[PDB]
Design a protein around this motif. Structure first.
Motif, PDB file in Angstrom:
ATOM      1  N   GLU A 104       0.172  -1.082   0.224  1.00 44.53           N
ATOM      2  CA  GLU A 104      -0.179   0.132   0.209  1.00 44.53           C
ATOM      3  C   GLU A 104       0.983   1.092   0.121  1.00 44.53           C
ATOM      4  O   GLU A 104       0.663   2.325  -0.851  1.00 44.53           O
ATOM      5  CB  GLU A 104      -1.209   0.135   0.880  1.00 44.53           C
ATOM      6  N   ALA A 105       1.474   1.633   1.097  1.00 43.47           N
ATOM      7  CA  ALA A 105       2.241   3.136   0.664  1.00 43.47           C
ATOM      8  C   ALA A 105       3.725   3.126  -0.544  1.00 43.47           C
ATOM      9  O   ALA A 105       4.030   3.562  -1.298  1.00 43.47           O
ATOM     10  CB  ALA A 105       4.148   2.526   1.901  1.00 43.47           C
ATOM     11  N   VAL A 106       4.196   1.591  -0.706  1.00 38.42           N
ATOM     12  CA  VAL A 106       4.938   1.285  -2.367  1.00 38.42           C
ATOM     13  C   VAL A 106       4.262   1.483  -3.401  1.00 38.42           C
ATOM     14  O   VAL A 106       4.315   3.110  -4.401  1.00 38.42           O
ATOM     15  CB  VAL A 106       5.281   0.326  -2.695  1.00 38.42           C
ATOM     16  N   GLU A 107       3.201   1.616  -3.411  1.00 33.49           N
ATOM     17  CA  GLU A 107       1.565   2.155  -4.399  1.00 33.49           C
ATOM     18  C   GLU A 107       1.564   3.293  -4.033  1.00 33.49           C
ATOM     19  O   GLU A 107       1.737   4.127  -5.360  1.00 33.49           O
ATOM     20  CB  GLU A 107       0.467   0.598  -4.236  1.00 33.49           C
ATOM     21  N   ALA A 108       1.033   3.967  -3.287  1.00 35.32           N
ATOM     22  CA  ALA A 108       0.899   5.196  -2.300  1.00 35.32           C
ATOM     23  C   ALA A 108       1.840   5.836  -3.260  1.00 35.32           C
ATOM     24  O   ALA A 108       1.681   7.680  -3.781  1.00 35.32           O
ATOM     25  CB  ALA A 108       0.211   5.992  -1.634  1.00 35.32           C
ATOM     26  N   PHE A 109       3.254   5.753  -2.910  1.00 34.47           N
ATOM     27  CA  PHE A 109       4.118   6.451  -3.907  1.00 34.47           C
ATOM     28  C   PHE A 109       4.624   6.787  -4.494  1.00 34.47           C
ATOM     29  O   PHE A 109       4.506   7.947  -5.128  1.00 34.47           O
ATOM     30  CB  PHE A 109       5.286   5.859  -2.520  1.00 34.47           C
ATOM     31  N   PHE A 110       4.226   5.214  -5.068  1.00 30.89           N
ATOM     32  CA  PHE A 110       4.297   5.776  -6.652  1.00 30.89           C
ATOM     33  C   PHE A 110       3.826   6.486  -7.953  1.00 30.89           C
ATOM     34  O   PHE A 110       3.449   7.000  -8.502  1.00 30.89           O
ATOM     35  CB  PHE A 110       5.464   4.633  -7.229  1.00 30.89           C
ATOM     36  N   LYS A 111       2.082   6.194  -7.177  1.00 32.01           N
ATOM     37  CA  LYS A 111       0.911   6.747  -7.774  1.00 32.01           C
ATOM     38  C   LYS A 111       0.974   8.064  -8.035  1.00 32.01           C
ATOM     39  O   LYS A 111       0.320   8.904  -8.333  1.00 32.01           O
ATOM     40  CB  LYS A 111      -0.219   5.742  -6.998  1.00 32.01           C
ATOM     41  N   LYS A 112       2.009   8.924  -6.754  1.00 29.32           N
ATOM     42  CA  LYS A 112       1.853  10.521  -6.337  1.00 29.32           C
ATOM     43  C   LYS A 112       2.561  10.899  -7.843  1.00 29.32           C
ATOM     44  O   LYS A 112       2.675  11.830  -7.952  1.00 29.32           O
ATOM     45  CB  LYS A 112       2.178  10.721  -4.981  1.00 29.32           C
ATOM     46  N   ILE A 113       4.148   9.989  -7.952  1.00 31.47           N
ATOM     47  CA  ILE A 113       4.888  10.455  -8.835  1.00 31.47           C
ATOM     48  C   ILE A 113       4.216   9.719 -10.445  1.00 31.47           C
ATOM     49  O   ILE A 113       4.771  10.215 -10.971  1.00 31.47           O
ATOM     50  CB  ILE A 113       5.447   9.190  -8.718  1.00 31.47           C
ATOM     51  N   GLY A 114       2.288   9.414 -10.955  1.00 35.74           N
ATOM     52  CA  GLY A 114       1.900   9.209 -11.777  1.00 35.74           C
ATOM     53  C   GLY A 114       1.968   7.954 -11.880  1.00 35.74           C
ATOM     54  O   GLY A 114       1.855   7.293 -13.388  1.00 35.74           O
ATOM     55  N   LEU A 115       2.865   7.149 -11.717  1.00 31.24           N
ATOM     56  CA  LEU A 115       2.689   5.492 -12.271  1.00 31.24           C
ATOM     57  C   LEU A 115       1.275   4.847 -11.801  1.00 31.24           C
ATOM     58  O   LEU A 115       0.714   5.838 -11.148  1.00 31.24           O
ATOM     59  CB  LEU A 115       3.856   4.709 -11.099  1.00 31.24           C
ATOM     60  N   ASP A 116       0.808   3.759 -13.039  1.00 31.04           N
ATOM     61  CA  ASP A 116      -0.418   3.486 -12.656  1.00 31.04           C
ATOM     62  C   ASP A 116      -0.078   1.981 -12.983  1.00 31.04           C
ATOM     63  O   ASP A 116       0.771   1.667 -14.462  1.00 31.04           O
ATOM     64  CB  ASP A 116      -1.467   3.982 -13.414  1.00 31.04           C
ATOM     65  N   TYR A 117      -0.862   1.411 -12.902  1.00 28.35           N
ATOM     66  CA  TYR A 117      -0.943  -0.321 -13.312  1.00 28.35           C
ATOM     67  C   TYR A 117      -1.526  -0.189 -14.429  1.00 28.35           C
ATOM     68  O   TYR A 117      -2.276   0.510 -15.087  1.00 28.35           O
ATOM     69  CB  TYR A 117      -2.418  -1.118 -12.891  1.00 28.35           C
ATOM     70  N   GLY A 118      -0.543  -1.179 -15.750  1.00 30.10           N
ATOM     71  CA  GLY A 118      -0.822  -0.940 -16.565  1.00 30.10           C
ATOM     72  C   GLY A 118      -0.237   0.463 -17.980  1.00 30.10           C
ATOM     73  O   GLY A 118      -0.223   0.569 -19.041  1.00 30.10           O
ATOM     74  N   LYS A 119       0.374   1.347 -17.494  1.00 28.51           N
ATOM     75  CA  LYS A 119       0.626   2.369 -17.294  1.00 28.51           C
ATOM     76  C   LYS A 119       1.876   2.206 -17.947  1.00 28.51           C
ATOM     77  O   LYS A 119       3.003   2.730 -16.678  1.00 28.51           O
ATOM     78  CB  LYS A 119      -0.006   3.759 -16.489  1.00 28.51           C
ATOM     79  N   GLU A 120       2.814   2.668 -18.640  1.00 30.62           N
ATOM     80  CA  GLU A 120       3.976   2.290 -18.968  1.00 30.62           C
ATOM     81  C   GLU A 120       4.674   4.570 -19.303  1.00 30.62           C
ATOM     82  O   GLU A 120       4.395   5.582 -19.290  1.00 30.62           O
ATOM     83  CB  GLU A 120       4.646   2.727 -20.311  1.00 30.62           C
ATOM     84  N   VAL A 121       5.090   4.736 -18.153  1.00 36.25           N
ATOM     85  CA  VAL A 121       6.207   5.723 -17.520  1.00 36.25           C
ATOM     86  C   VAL A 121       7.466   5.764 -17.914  1.00 36.25           C
ATOM     87  O   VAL A 121       8.114   4.811 -17.715  1.00 36.25           O
ATOM     88  CB  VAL A 121       6.494   6.521 -16.514  1.00 36.25           C
ATOM     89  N   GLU A 122       7.865   6.738 -18.863  1.00 37.41           N
ATOM     90  CA  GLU A 122       9.232   7.259 -19.402  1.00 37.41           C
ATOM     91  C   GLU A 122      10.000   7.780 -18.405  1.00 37.41           C
ATOM     92  O   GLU A 122       9.138   8.929 -17.517  1.00 37.41           O
ATOM     93  CB  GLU A 122       9.586   7.807 -20.362  1.00 37.41           C
ATOM     94  N   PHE A 123      11.263   8.860 -18.692  1.00 37.89           N
ATOM     95  CA  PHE A 123      11.945   9.288 -17.543  1.00 37.89           C
ATOM     96  C   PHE A 123      11.202  10.802 -17.428  1.00 37.89           C
ATOM     97  O   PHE A 123      11.567  10.990 -16.160  1.00 37.89           O
ATOM     98  CB  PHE A 123      13.460   8.930 -17.788  1.00 37.89           C
ATOM     99  N   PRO A 124      11.209  11.504 -18.693  1.00 34.42           N
ATOM    100  CA  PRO A 124      10.956  13.343 -18.676  1.00 34.42           C
ATOM    101  C   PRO A 124       9.496  12.906 -17.423  1.00 34.42           C
ATOM    102  O   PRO A 124       9.712  13.971 -16.857  1.00 34.42           O
ATOM    103  CB  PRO A 124      10.425  13.038 -19.704  1.00 34.42           C
ATOM    104  N   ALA A 125       8.381  12.268 -18.072  1.00 34.34           N
ATOM    105  CA  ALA A 125       7.511  11.943 -17.193  1.00 34.34           C
ATOM    106  C   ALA A 125       7.489  11.658 -15.478  1.00 34.34           C
ATOM    107  O   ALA A 125       6.990  12.339 -14.985  1.00 34.34           O
ATOM    108  CB  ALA A 125       6.264  11.531 -17.921  1.00 34.34           C
ATOM    109  N   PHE A 126       8.233  10.626 -15.373  1.00 31.08           N
ATOM    110  CA  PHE A 126       8.780  10.251 -14.260  1.00 31.08           C
ATOM    111  C   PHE A 126       9.209  11.540 -13.397  1.00 31.08           C
ATOM    112  O   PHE A 126       9.099  11.696 -11.627  1.00 31.08           O
ATOM    113  CB  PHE A 126      10.271   9.293 -14.474  1.00 31.08           C
ATOM    114  N   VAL A 127      10.253  12.327 -13.721  1.00 30.04           N
ATOM    115  CA  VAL A 127      11.320  12.936 -12.952  1.00 30.04           C
ATOM    116  C   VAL A 127      10.338  14.167 -12.960  1.00 30.04           C
ATOM    117  O   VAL A 127      10.057  14.998 -12.087  1.00 30.04           O
ATOM    118  CB  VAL A 127      12.790  12.987 -13.506  1.00 30.04           C
ATOM    119  N   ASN A 128       8.883  14.636 -13.946  1.00 28.28           N
ATOM    120  CA  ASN A 128       8.106  15.341 -13.406  1.00 28.28           C
ATOM    121  C   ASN A 128       7.124  14.955 -12.959  1.00 28.28           C
ATOM    122  O   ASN A 128       6.677  16.086 -12.061  1.00 28.28           O
ATOM    123  CB  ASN A 128       7.306  15.601 -15.034  1.00 28.28           C
ATOM    124  N   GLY A 129       7.100  13.971 -12.653  1.00 36.98           N
ATOM    125  CA  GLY A 129       5.871  13.541 -11.445  1.00 36.98           C
ATOM    126  C   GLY A 129       6.969  13.676  -9.428  1.00 36.98           C
ATOM    127  O   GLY A 129       6.270  13.604  -8.905  1.00 36.98           O
TER     128      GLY A 129
END
Ligand SMILES: O=C1N2C=C(c3ccc(O)cc3)N=C(Cc3ccccc3)C2=N[C@@]1(Cc1ccc(O)cc1)OO
Ligand SMILES: [Ca+2]
Length: 189
Positions: free
Chosen positions: A60-85
């Motif tokens: 739950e903690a890891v999920e909330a942490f990385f969802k805040k960065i913009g990651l989601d299930y089934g969504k691919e995130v590349e570096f530029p969007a990752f660091v903006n997150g």
């Protein structure tokens, strides 16, 4: 702890790029929440022998942490969007911490330390940090783990507590506080 960010410092961008590359184990320039949660649960928690409840709180903690960065299930995130997150997350957590509220980074720390903590201290030993460090890969040598402990302010037991690691993490991951340099020894720049 310093509260001002340094998002334009290439050192901060590169610290996250380094970590992105570390997470991008299949080398395709993309990261998914599925991959992240699998690392947290199927890999780390399983190898640590975490209990069902610990494994779930940690997920739950890891999920909330990385969802805040913009990651989601089934969504691919590349570096530029990752660091903006990371900018969303950093502002979010620094605000919370400065107001004496639980941050996502603190919540993650509590969940990790809880796996090791048998006495309610919210603290871990050097050997436990070596264990977590080697299994997660983020502190992949004993010398680096030793550097983390030499670096931090330890408690009356020579143990690293969650409040201290949270302060260090704010500076290391969010604000590029020079006092946090060397948190992960010679591994993470
Ligand atoms: O510091 C934390 N990390 C930061 C990043 C990371 C990843 C990408 C970035 O751009 C920036 C930082 N990756 C991992 C290892 C990991 C990654 C994904 C799922 C499980 C474990 C990691 N483990 C921790 C766990 C932790 C959290 C709070 C504490 O008080 C103590 C210990 O130390
Ligand atoms: Ca990938």
């Amino acid at each position: 702890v310093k509260l001002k960010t340094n998002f334009e410092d290439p050192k901060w961008v590169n610290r996250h790029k380094f970590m992105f590359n570390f997470l991008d184990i299949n080398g395709n320039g993309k990261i998914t929440l599925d991959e992240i949660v699998s690392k947290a649960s199927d890999d780390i928690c399983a190898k640590l022998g975490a209990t069902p409840a610990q494994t779930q709180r940690h997920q739950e903690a890891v999920e909330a942490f990385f969802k805040k960065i913009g990651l989601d299930y089934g969504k691919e995130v590349e570096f530029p969007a990752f660091v903006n997150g990371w900018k969303e997350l950093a502002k979010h957590d620094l605000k919370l911490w400065s107001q004496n509220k639980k941050s996502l980074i603190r919540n993650w720390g509590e969940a990790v330390f809880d796996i090791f903590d048998k006495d309610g201290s919210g603290s871990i030993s050097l050997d436990e940090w070596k264990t977590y460090g080697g299994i997660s890969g983020i502190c992949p040598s004993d010398e680096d783990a030793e550097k983390t402990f030499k670096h931090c302010d330890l408690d009356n037991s020579g143990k690293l507590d969650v409040d201290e690691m949270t302060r260090q993490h704010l500076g290391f991951w969010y604000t590029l506080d020079p006092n946090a340099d060397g948190l992960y020894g010679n591994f993470v720049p």
